[PDB]
Design an enzyme around this catalytic site. Structure first.
Site, PDB file in Angstrom:
ATOM      1  N   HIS D  65       0.861  -1.209   0.000  1.00 37.16           N
ATOM      2  CA  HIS D  65       0.000   0.000   0.000  1.00 37.16           C
ATOM      3  C   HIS D  65       0.883   1.240   0.000  1.00 37.16           C
ATOM      4  O   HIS D  65       1.948   1.283   0.673  1.00 37.16           O
ATOM      5  CB  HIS D  65      -0.998  -0.004   1.162  1.00 37.16           C
ATOM      6  CG  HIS D  65      -2.385   0.363   0.769  1.00 37.16           C
ATOM      7  ND1 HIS D  65      -2.783   1.686   0.613  1.00 37.16           N
ATOM      8  CD2 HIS D  65      -3.479  -0.403   0.563  1.00 37.16           C
ATOM      9  CE1 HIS D  65      -4.067   1.714   0.311  1.00 37.16           C
ATOM     10  NE2 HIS D  65      -4.513   0.440   0.266  1.00 37.16           N
ATOM     11  N   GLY D 109       0.037  -5.218   1.460  1.00 37.03           N
ATOM     12  CA  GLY D 109      -1.053  -5.391   0.487  1.00 37.03           C
ATOM     13  C   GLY D 109      -0.577  -6.075  -0.776  1.00 37.03           C
ATOM     14  O   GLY D 109      -1.388  -6.757  -1.382  1.00 37.03           O
ATOM     15  N   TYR D 139      -6.356  -4.908   9.590  1.00 33.10           N
ATOM     16  CA  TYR D 139      -6.606  -5.566   8.279  1.00 33.10           C
ATOM     17  C   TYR D 139      -8.053  -6.100   8.268  1.00 33.10           C
ATOM     18  O   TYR D 139      -8.633  -6.403   9.314  1.00 33.10           O
ATOM     19  CB  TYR D 139      -5.547  -6.639   8.019  1.00 33.10           C
ATOM     20  CG  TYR D 139      -5.103  -6.671   6.588  1.00 33.10           C
ATOM     21  CD1 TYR D 139      -4.128  -5.800   6.138  1.00 33.10           C
ATOM     22  CD2 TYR D 139      -5.692  -7.533   5.682  1.00 33.10           C
ATOM     23  CE1 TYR D 139      -3.737  -5.773   4.811  1.00 33.10           C
ATOM     24  CE2 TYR D 139      -5.303  -7.528   4.349  1.00 33.10           C
ATOM     25  CZ  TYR D 139      -4.329  -6.649   3.912  1.00 33.10           C
ATOM     26  OH  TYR D 139      -3.915  -6.671   2.619  1.00 33.10           O
TER      27      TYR D 139
HETATM   28  C1  LIG Z   1      -1.191  -1.070   5.228  1.00 28.32           C
HETATM   29  C2  LIG Z   1      -0.802  -2.293   4.412  1.00 28.32           C
HETATM   30  C3  LIG Z   1       0.422  -1.964   3.627  1.00 28.32           C
HETATM   31  O1  LIG Z   1       0.805  -2.634   2.663  1.00 28.32           O
HETATM   32  S1  LIG Z   1       1.270  -0.613   4.126  1.00 28.32           S
HETATM   33  C4  LIG Z   1       2.850  -0.718   3.336  1.00 28.32           C
HETATM   34  C5  LIG Z   1       3.721  -1.843   3.851  1.00 28.32           C
HETATM   35  N1  LIG Z   1       5.002  -1.764   3.169  1.00 28.32           N
HETATM   36  C6  LIG Z   1       6.162  -1.769   3.809  1.00 28.32           C
HETATM   37  O2  LIG Z   1       6.242  -1.872   5.017  1.00 28.32           O
HETATM   38  C7  LIG Z   1       7.413  -1.608   2.995  1.00 28.32           C
HETATM   39  C8  LIG Z   1       8.007  -0.267   3.391  1.00 28.32           C
HETATM   40  N2  LIG Z   1       9.268   0.017   2.753  1.00 28.32           N
HETATM   41  C9  LIG Z   1      10.384  -0.614   3.073  1.00 28.32           C
HETATM   42  O3  LIG Z   1      10.421  -1.469   3.935  1.00 28.32           O
HETATM   43  C10 LIG Z   1      11.591  -0.218   2.282  1.00 28.32           C
HETATM   44  O4  LIG Z   1      11.329   1.019   1.629  1.00 28.32           O
HETATM   45  C11 LIG Z   1      11.925  -1.187   1.159  1.00 28.32           C
HETATM   46  C12 LIG Z   1      10.643  -1.569   0.415  1.00 28.32           C
HETATM   47  C13 LIG Z   1      12.706  -2.371   1.722  1.00 28.32           C
HETATM   48  C14 LIG Z   1      12.763  -0.460   0.127  1.00 28.32           C
HETATM   49  O5  LIG Z   1      14.008  -0.143   0.724  1.00 28.32           O
HETATM   50  P1  LIG Z   1      14.997   0.943   0.049  1.00 28.32           P
HETATM   51  O6  LIG Z   1      16.111   1.171   1.037  1.00 28.32           O
HETATM   52  O7  LIG Z   1      15.485   0.412  -1.279  1.00 28.32           O
HETATM   53  O8  LIG Z   1      14.169   2.266  -0.211  1.00 28.32           O
HETATM   54  P2  LIG Z   1      13.766   3.192   1.028  1.00 28.32           P
HETATM   55  O9  LIG Z   1      13.310   2.437   2.252  1.00 28.32           O
HETATM   56  O10 LIG Z   1      14.988   4.003   1.420  1.00 28.32           O
HETATM   57  O11 LIG Z   1      12.572   4.102   0.505  1.00 28.32           O
HETATM   58  C15 LIG Z   1      12.489   4.661  -0.796  1.00 28.32           C
HETATM   59  C16 LIG Z   1      11.371   5.697  -0.661  1.00 28.32           C
HETATM   60  O12 LIG Z   1      10.092   5.137  -1.011  1.00 28.32           O
HETATM   61  C17 LIG Z   1       9.238   5.188   0.152  1.00 28.32           C
HETATM   62  N3  LIG Z   1       8.348   4.026   0.378  1.00 28.32           N
HETATM   63  C18 LIG Z   1       8.716   2.757   0.651  1.00 28.32           C
HETATM   64  N4  LIG Z   1       7.624   1.977   0.821  1.00 28.32           N
HETATM   65  C19 LIG Z   1       6.555   2.771   0.662  1.00 28.32           C
HETATM   66  C20 LIG Z   1       5.107   2.609   0.723  1.00 28.32           C
HETATM   67  N5  LIG Z   1       4.650   1.381   0.981  1.00 28.32           N
HETATM   68  N6  LIG Z   1       4.296   3.677   0.511  1.00 28.32           N
HETATM   69  C21 LIG Z   1       4.809   4.887   0.238  1.00 28.32           C
HETATM   70  N7  LIG Z   1       6.129   5.112   0.179  1.00 28.32           N
HETATM   71  C22 LIG Z   1       7.028   4.118   0.383  1.00 28.32           C
HETATM   72  C23 LIG Z   1      10.149   5.288   1.372  1.00 28.32           C
HETATM   73  O13 LIG Z   1       9.487   5.849   2.524  1.00 28.32           O
HETATM   74  C24 LIG Z   1      11.237   6.161   0.799  1.00 28.32           C
HETATM   75  O14 LIG Z   1      10.704   7.470   0.917  1.00 28.32           O
HETATM   76  P3  LIG Z   1      11.563   8.807   0.708  1.00 28.32           P
HETATM   77  O15 LIG Z   1      13.023   8.483   0.960  1.00 28.32           O
HETATM   78  O16 LIG Z   1      11.044   9.806   1.722  1.00 28.32           O
HETATM   79  O17 LIG Z   1      11.318   9.270  -0.714  1.00 28.32           O
HETATM   80  S2  LIG Z   1      -0.468  -3.522   5.491  1.00 28.32           S
HETATM   81  O18 LIG Z   1       0.770  -3.216   6.158  1.00 28.32           O
HETATM   82  O19 LIG Z   1      -0.272  -4.735   4.759  1.00 28.32           O
HETATM   83  O20 LIG Z   1      -1.612  -3.608   6.360  1.00 28.32           O
END
Ligand SMILES: C[C@@H](C(=O)SCCNC(=O)CCNC(=O)[C@H](O)C(C)(C)COP(=O)(O)OP(=O)(O)OC[C@H]1O[C@@H](n2cnc3c(N)ncnc32)[C@H](O)[C@@H]1OP(=O)(O)O)S(=O)(=O)O
Ligand SMILES: C[C@@H](C(=O)SCCNC(=O)CCNC(=O)[C@H](O)C(C)(C)COP(=O)(O)OP(=O)(O)OC[C@H]1O[C@@H](n2cnc3c(N)ncnc32)[C@H](O)[C@@H]1OP(=O)(O)O)S(=O)(=O)O
Ligand SMILES: C[C@@H](C(=O)SCCNC(=O)CCNC(=O)[C@H](O)C(C)(C)COP(=O)(O)OP(=O)(O)OC[C@H]1O[C@@H](n2cnc3c(N)ncnc32)[C@H](O)[C@@H]1OP(=O)(O)O)S(=O)(=O)O
Ligand SMILES: C[C@@H](C(=O)SCCNC(=O)CCNC(=O)[C@H](O)C(C)(C)COP(=O)(O)OP(=O)(O)OC[C@H]1O[C@@H](n2cnc3c(N)ncnc32)[C@H](O)[C@@H]1OP(=O)(O)O)S(=O)(=O)O
Ligand SMILES: C[C@@H](C(=O)SCCNC(=O)CCNC(=O)[C@H](O)C(C)(C)COP(=O)(O)OP(=O)(O)OC[C@H]1O[C@@H](n2cnc3c(N)ncnc32)[C@H](O)[C@@H]1OP(=O)(O)O)S(=O)(=O)O
Ligand SMILES: C[C@@H](C(=O)SCCNC(=O)CCNC(=O)[C@H](O)C(C)(C)COP(=O)(O)OP(=O)(O)OC[C@H]1O[C@@H](n2cnc3c(N)ncnc32)[C@H](O)[C@@H]1OP(=O)(O)O)S(=O)(=O)O
Ligand SMILES: [K+]
Ligand SMILES: [K+]
Ligand code: NI
Ligand code: NI
EC number: 4.1.1.-
Lengths: 260, 260, 260, 260, 260, 260
Positions: D65, D109, D139
């Site tokens: 998401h 998601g 969820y």
């Molecule tokens: C609510 C439901 C959801 O799906 S919520 C989203 C859950 N997703 C996550 O927790 C993954 C969050 N991101 C991460 O763990 C890491 O960004 C990840 C994906 C390993 C990528 O690592 P990376 O070091 O290569 O890149 P960065 O962490 O430095 O971030 C790059 C920029 O993109 C952003 N970003 C990441 N994930 C999301 C997201 N899901 N929604 C919106 N923005 C996101 C991240 O915050 C970072 O932002 P900025 O550096 O400020 O431009 S639920 O959780 O299932 O209920």
């Protein structure tokens, strides 16, 4: 314009009037396709209430399913995309109240059709018959379920097992009808109620109708039960009795049923 | 012992009388909390039957949900822990019969509250209205379900789509009420029945009541259907029409509903 | 051919008449075993409709469950293979209409038995009582469900919670009966309706009856709900009150129930 | 063309490739709308099998998401018409098999999304996390249900309660994945499986997929159970913890959850 | 004795060996009728466990449904009283464990047959395919549900959509098989377990098997959902593809499916 | 402090350690009363995760239900208020994750108890067996359902019909366990996972746990099917075999079951 119905809207009420009296408003595919197009065309924000009616002075509201369009050769007569099955789902899912305004006699599929509508207001001279046992038809689960939400099981079983007409007075007493009025008051009574409804909150009406529809359908069973019933129905629409039912109607005679 | 109800015990019968006449026994949180505390305090072996009543002579039995406590801010007005939702569950789960003894007019949530009780005995002058469509309220599934166990679908849809009050005589005829009494005989007649029930086996009464509760609730659906209904309800409580309905009531004018 | 019933056939109609007047047609195992054998013997292609009756002039149609055959506590008195539970399933699964033709008073399990039949036609002088709360019996879920398909919840709860008899006229009004006739007219009225049904399509009758049975049973619940109810029922059949209810009837005194 | 996906067809196989690498294929509304339009455009008789993929060499298959589009109000983040909820329904109801071909990490998601697809084929280096407990998200029932048809309850609970990533190897061992292949072999292995499926009877595939979908949904509950769950979810999306989870994620710090 | 099966009893274990090698134990009516008779004849208190097997050394355990007995021209091929549908119900309702001891290749309806049994012990050289998409068959709900209780949704969809054989090793890894042994050890391993089971309490085994059967079936849906699925099934068994699938099998050529 | 458990708190994790080694942690009423008291006492915001364990070096994790507290015949041994039935409901409804940390052998009701918990981490030397068929006990529907959410039907039937212990390795492969570790690493492996979970959003965990519980329970059946099952269970707890099973255990000998 429609070939088989006439639509008049005043303010927020639409009246859909059957125009198939040369076949006593039998539920032919061409007639049902026009009724569903007319309803679809009326699914607009400025329409708030529908009335279904036969023309003023009709002896026969609807003669029910067109017996000529019932399949003979081992096909289900009431499958999911049969026009009667389509119209009842469409009425039940329609986001506006649909009032059946009944003058004359109601038969078989037409009785199910008015039972699927939201309110029934009837002339004191109107009569109601449920006919599958006159023809040997294995009525489907959905269709039978549509007949069980107003009157009790014993009353429903009398109607189906006898196929005997009941009066508007008895239909009112057992819970099938909302109101019974003298025929000369029928249009005025029904239009007053439809116009009253059309001043109420249409989004509240729509979601409450949908909640009732879902609750009404929420009698659930397992796949084995459904498949067992489907086997039973197939044995009926494969029967000599079903062939005898249709043959007797075409030959204008009384069927002789034998239990095979 | 309660600010908003008066309780009297006569042998095994408890009478809970509303004491909220200044707001016509509207289902305010403080009123419902006292009613629920009173019921809870009566959940004792030596109490066998409850009567819910308005004071003798009341014109208004209950004006229904307190309109000043209905959420207007895009929140669900009928969530699980809303007072009306709480009291209907408590009445239905209570292991003693609860008789609604009705004098005066009954509105909206208060109609659902008496429908949730076990028996309704009413004055010949009492009247009954279901009002969500006056306000644009998306009534909830459980609340609608509670209105479907006495009168048939066509009758229930007339009540809800018209929001028109029905007489005690009609409410008896369609199966909503048990008995209709002249107001001078209402108290005596209801107490005689409550004392009679109180001579019967309370453990048998409690388990049969609970069997009927669980059978009444056993209309089951999948998560997708529930979530789809919840989406429809949120579109209604987020609508311009819902704001207009609340506003029009508070400003004492006729609402102008437009279908969004 | 049977000790406790007499069977006559008239064209395609079979009348099963009770012959257990010495015990007021109480539902003893020996009586029910004979009724079930007679019904099984009549499952033939030349039989189209069954009538259940007591002998002409009966004051008591059936005094209900044989109280001498109810377990003294610690045992479920209404287990799956109890004779009342067997006869109601057999009536409901029987592929021919079964009409209960009622002269005299009906008590307890006998009321459930006629409710399980397809139609009820009654003498103007007949009376109906549902009696478990007189004895402290925890009626079973299936049994209670069989009482909920004709009259509304408030009406069923009055019947069960009061155990007071209702008249034929009121049973007609609330939806329990199909017809009420003068006792002198009862047999001819019922025979003419049975003969009429006997000319209809028997396979269509049998499949629609079965569809209705399945839709009627299709109130579903999870295992925890069922086991929670069974635990409540066991607390009732383990209770002092249950033993007191049984003892009081046998000793011809008013029970003193205390809530344990 | 599409702004946020690239579509390639190889005879009967269509490959939908994410083009939203800037945001690590986060499930924004504009990305999901493009994905759903591309699927809708491929619902034609000459297409028999769909592959969803990230671009070759992606480190992140999808970041889940878009956290900037999650309602942080007292508003439901996973209501019926939220894009994630729309695309899982559309994948499930799509009358052709949809294969998720996974290279990179899968989050939240996006994990539910590939779980809603028919087959998952993954690189040996891919990883999978279910993240709502990292943010305090309640969820929704349908969403959780979509995670329960592959691995067992103990495994699902570990995944959700830990939010810890699992390997492709562990995901294969517990029943989440169909096949694990070296990244250099992924595309060819997945295309040969889709070409093979595309030679089979599509009307048979479509009806069996729909039969599995409805059996998979057929875990039914009553309205009270659903509304009670909805009440608990609302208490979570109204919580301080939910605010703290969102703020912590955006501010790139550990949340401090306190249980209100 | 039996033309199409051989039965050997060892202490309390009965081994039913297929004797229809002429058609590689295809599920012809004459073969299934003898299998059900032999099973029925073994429903005696001194028999405690059943083994189903092909003859020692068989290349093909069962070639699946008899293709010559599958209806063409628009009859449902998998109706309630089809032999395959009868044998799976009988296996699941049989009050003794039924162990499928598999040597050789298992196809289509024979795969559903072994999945409907209680335990599966297989030779290391055994192979398993589910074939409806090779023929354009719309497999029925009950039949599909019988395939969903062991492996996860993704694995089941791979098996069905590919119709590709899987190895015993893979069938064990995904949860379809209990044990895989070398063919020389198959009888010893299976009989040791069957003899061990035969020491246990047979009434406990019977009631627990029936509890699991009921729980396994308890995925419930409303009548509309079932009738909709039946309409989709009919469109497939009415398709040109279904005719092509059957003709291609009979002519030993590759079907060319076109999606109507 | 508690007579039959010892509780330690490590940050936000609570460890409930059995202290009933004198009866090998058999689930006696008084042991289960202390386990439930200790859980209730730990239902506070500062506790986020529970571990259930036997003392370090235990050969027997738990010997299962206390056989001495089972009824002698003619009574349901697994009624809703039985301690095993109470503790599984309490574990499943507890709003924090409960991890079973297993060292030693697990028997019968104790196997169901750990299956009812959220995660199972076990020593490589731990063993698991399901024992009702050793004693002739008619397990109940809820208890059997609790065993069906991890391994597939064939595996569950092998476990129950054989009553044969399985290794930790096999319990991992079939999906019963989350993790298997060397006994020296068990405590700190489990605590690391509990501390990790304890940093996550507890309100999200609680509502997802409750959603999984509701969805797990949502296999629904009608009242007739439940009462049919209860009649079958009663025939087993009334049987000579049930008495033989209890007597054989008491007399430390091999039961001779005869199937009545
Ligand atoms: C609510 C439901 C959801 O799906 S919520 C989203 C859950 N997703 C996550 O927790 C993954 C969050 N991101 C991460 O763990 C890491 O960004 C990840 C994906 C390993 C990528 O690592 P990376 O070091 O290569 O890149 P960065 O962490 O430095 O971030 C790059 C920029 O993109 C952003 N970003 C990441 N994930 C999301 C997201 N899901 N929604 C919106 N923005 C996101 C991240 O915050 C970072 O932002 P900025 O550096 O400020 O431009 S639920 O959780 O299932 O209920
Ligand atoms: C399958 C479900 C159905 O709805 S089957 C249809 C059930 N409907 C009926 O059984 C009513 C059949 N018709 C009648 O009883 C009488 O025609 C009707 C309603 C009472 C009025 O009598 P009438 O003397 O005024 O008019 P007629 O007797 O001359 O009939 C006019 C011509 O129309 C014909 N007709 C009538 N009903 C139908 C129909 N439902 N489908 C096809 N044809 C119908 C009737 O046979 C006569 O034909 P012709 O003599 O050829 O001009 S089910 O049974 O509920 O399961
Ligand atoms: C959400 C559900 C609900 O139940 S919403 C509420 C539905 N109830 C109604 O529509 C009834 C509205 N009230 C009326 O029509 C009239 O008050 C009624 C009941 C006919 C009584 O006539 P009346 O001329 O004597 O009225 P009053 O002089 O008392 O009018 C103002 C004083 O009474 C009070 N009152 C009355 N009804 C309510 C109410 N529902 N909520 C809160 N207060 C109410 C009102 O606050 C005011 O008291 P004062 O503070 O002294 O002015 S739903 O609609 O079922 O979905
Ligand atoms: C368990 C379910 C049941 O059906 S239990 C049984 C419910 N039935 C009742 O409560 C009706 C009980 N009986 C009565 O109300 C009256 O006995 C009866 C029908 C009204 C008519 O009175 P009466 O003055 O003419 O005759 P008596 O009372 O003096 O008794 C006459 C002879 O028949 C016998 N009798 C009566 N009722 C039953 C019964 N339920 N089970 C077994 N036997 C019964 C009674 O013992 C006496 O027989 P003899 O002394 O041998 O001549 S439940 O309650 O629905 O849960
Ligand atoms: C409808 C459901 C079904 O189960 S339909 C059937 C699915 N079964 C299959 O696809 C397997 C079909 N059979 C085969 O592929 C081959 O027989 C097989 C198993 C690979 C072995 O080849 P083979 O060269 O060793 O032996 P043959 O082909 O010569 O066959 C020996 C004799 O048995 C016959 N036979 C075989 N299978 C069937 C069948 N399913 N139905 C009816 N007859 C069958 C085959 O025709 C041959 O008979 P003769 O030619 O008279 O000697 S569904 O698909 O699950 O929905
Ligand atoms: C009915 C449901 C139940 O859960 S009933 C319980 C199922 N559990 C079992 O079958 C395990 C039975 N016990 C055993 O197999 C062995 O005791 C076990 C656990 C392997 C340990 O062997 P051991 O030689 O080290 O110890 P002992 O045999 O000498 O027993 C120590 C004393 O405690 C006793 N004991 C054991 N298990 C139970 C039990 N479940 N309930 C009540 N007492 C038990 C055992 O009889 C012995 O007692 P004394 O000889 O009097 O000191 S069900 O079966 O799931 O349906
Ligand atoms: K007549
Ligand atoms: K036979
Ligand atoms: Ni219902
Ligand atoms: Ni399930």
């Amino acid at each position: 314009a429609y070939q088989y119905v006439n639509v008049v809207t005043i303010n927020k009420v639409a009246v859909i009037e059957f125009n198939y009296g040369r076949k006593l408003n039998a539920l032919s595919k061409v007639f049902i396709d026009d009724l569903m197009q007319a309803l679809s065309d009326l699914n607009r924000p400025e329409i708030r209430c529908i009335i279904l009616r036969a023309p003023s002075g009709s002896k026969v509201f609807s003669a029910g399913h067109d017996i000529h369009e019932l399949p003979s050769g081992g096909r289900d007569p009431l499958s999911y995309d049969d026009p009667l099955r389509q119209i009842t789902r469409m009425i039940q899912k329609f986001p506006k109240p649909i009032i059946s305004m009944v003058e004359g006699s109601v038969w078989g599929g037409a009785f199910e059709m008015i039972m699927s509508s939201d309110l029934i207001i009837a002339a004191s001279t109107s009569t109601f018959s449920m006919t599958p046992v006159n023809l040997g038809v294995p009525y489907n689960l959905v269709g039978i379920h549509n007949l069980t939400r107003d009157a009790g099981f014993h009353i429903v079983k009398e109607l189906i097992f006898t196929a005997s007409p009941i009066t508007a007075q008895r239909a009112l007493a057992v819970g099938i009808l909302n109101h019974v009025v003298e025929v000369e008051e029928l249009e005025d009574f029904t239009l007053q109620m439809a116009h009253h409804i059309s001043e109420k909150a249409p989004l509240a009406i729509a979601v409450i109708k949908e909640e009732l529809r879902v609750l009404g359908e929420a009698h659930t069973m397992n796949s084995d039960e459904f498949e067992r019933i489907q086997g039973m129905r197939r044995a009926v629409y494969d029967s000599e009795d079903y062939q005898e039912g249709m043959n007797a109607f075409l030959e204008k005679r009384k069927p002789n049923f034998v239990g095979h």
